[PDB]
Write a protein that binds this ligand. Structure first.
Ligand SMILES: Cc1cc(N2CCCCC2)nc(CO)n1
Length: 185
């Protein structure tokens, strides 16, 4: 891919974060805390899962960013509608306004309904996420493996403004405490 030149500076939106998340001062890193992080509840916060949005909203153009997933056991990454449900239980699917991939239990899957098995030869330490709003495309790249394609969602029905989407995952095992980090351009 030659997509790096649509590079955007993503920051995390503290107001949207699950109340157990800890976002760094520079708003570029997020991890699961071992407890509630002493913030007020609000209608934006994801209640059921360790999720947070980027502050940026996109309704046109091409956008690219990279995320560090080093030493994590579980995570979700991609984009979502600004209007996605925040409270209660829901599945990550394009019908619910999410275009995502994830890791759990040593398998990588795309968030279709039902989910799609991914074939990755080199487990990624950094993921590139490319959005072409006009084309209706969300693509994922393996930065650890020379930028090799992971998955492409096409004919996407964005149906509104998009936000970068993150899930640091639970840490039941004690092996998933590491942060997600937005990587420098
Ligand atoms: C804990 C878990 C894992 C899982 N997978 C998806 C298929 C590939 C393997 C991982 N699915 C579920 C569904 O409740 N739970």
């Amino acid at each position: 891919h030659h997509h790096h030149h649509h590079m955007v500076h993503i920051t995390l939106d503290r107001n949207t974060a699950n109340s157990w998340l800890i976002i760094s001062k520079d708003r570029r890193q997020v991890r699961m805390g071992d407890t509630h992080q002493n913030v007020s509840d609000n209608k934006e916060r994801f209640s059921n899962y360790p999720m947070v949005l980027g502050a940026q909203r996109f309704s046109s153009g091409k956008m690219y960013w990279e995320v560090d997933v080093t030493q994590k056991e579980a995570w979700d990454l991609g984009v979502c509608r600004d209007s996605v449900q925040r409270k209660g239980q829901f599945s990550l699917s394009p019908e619910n306004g999410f275009w995502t991939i994830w890791l759990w239990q040593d398998s990588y899957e795309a968030g279709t309904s039902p989910q799609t098995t991914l074939h990755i030869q080199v487990p990624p330490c950094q993921i590139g996420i490319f959005v072409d709003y006009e084309a209706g495309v969300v693509s994922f790249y393996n930065i650890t493996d020379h930028g090799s394609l992971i998955y492409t969602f096409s004919e996407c029905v964005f149906a509104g403004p998009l936000r970068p989407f993150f899930n640091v995952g639970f840490n039941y095992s004690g092996g998933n405490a590491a942060p997600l980090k937005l990587c420098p351009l």
